[PDB]
Design a protein around this ligand. Structure first.
Ligand SMILES: O=c1cc[nH]c(=O)[nH]1
Length: 223
DNA sequence: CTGTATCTT
DNA sequence: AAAGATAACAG
């Protein structure tokens, strides 16, 4: 039992031996010696421990992990108790509130509830240097998350991809737009939320798309 | 008033 | 590549 959930490791292990991955892990290792890197090592792959890869139905793709102390824990936009929801998450909650009638602020920021239902909470970049947004971009993470997106794209069907922000949107070309649904909008951070995230209705839209594909909708309130 | 993207150069 | 300009609002 460890970092990678079994089904994910089984389908993503081929990346482990590739030079970019070995180099990526080396960079992250080196960074952790000189700076605080988020999330902690045992939580970088939390997104593989919530459900079987074949049970993924929705993929929310963010930019990179929260860069503040105690925030990031491996699920994009999620913070474990007792850490209060960061600005981005408060905005996600505000959107859910107007988008989903029954949605009410859960009193915490832990999104494991969605992840357990098949919502992959992935970030384009999986580690970040403390206090430096997107500091670990272009070091190899993108190729790894490309592998995750590619596998899902090729082996699943009717997945709903939620690409939040410019960086997450780089994965768009990797998805078969007829085989899957790709919804794109601005990143929920206060610095960009006003550019489309508010009013995007991605949560209700995701459920509509799921229902049309004959899949059970995500209970966004189940947190 | 300080901290939490996106576009342009 | 990296940083300036722009931007919106909570604590
Ligand atoms: O996990 C997170 C948190 C904030 N912003 C992101 O892109 N991802």
């Amino acid at each position: 039992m460890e970092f990678f959930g079994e089904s994910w490791k089984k389908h993503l292990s081929g990346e482990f031996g590739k030079p970019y991955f070995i180099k990526l892990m080396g960079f992250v290792a080196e960074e952790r010696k000189h700076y605080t890197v988020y999330p902690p090592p045992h939580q970088v792959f939390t997104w593989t421990q919530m459900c079987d890869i074949k049970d993924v139905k929705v993929v929310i793709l963010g930019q990179d992990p929260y860069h503040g102390p105690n925030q990031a824990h491996g699920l994009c936009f999620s913070v474990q108790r007792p850490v209060p929801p960061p600005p981005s998450l408060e905005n996600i909650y505000k959107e859910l509130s107007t988008d989903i009638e029954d949605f009410v602020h859960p009193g915490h920021g832990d999104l494991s509830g969605w992840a357990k239902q098949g919502v992959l909470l992935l970030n384009a970049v999986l580690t970040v240097r403390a206090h430096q947004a997107n500091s670990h971009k272009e070091r190899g993470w993108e190729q790894f998350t490309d592998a995750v997106v590619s596998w899902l794209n090729q082996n699943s069907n009717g997945l709903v991809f939620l690409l939040w922000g410019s960086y997450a949107q780089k994965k768009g070309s990797a998805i078969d737009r007829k085989r899957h649904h790709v919804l794109q909008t601005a990143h929920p951070s206060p610095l960009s939320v006003y550019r489309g995230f508010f009013g995007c209705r991605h949560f209700s839209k995701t459920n509509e798309l799921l229902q049309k594909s004959g899949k059970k909708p995500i209970d966004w309130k189940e947190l």
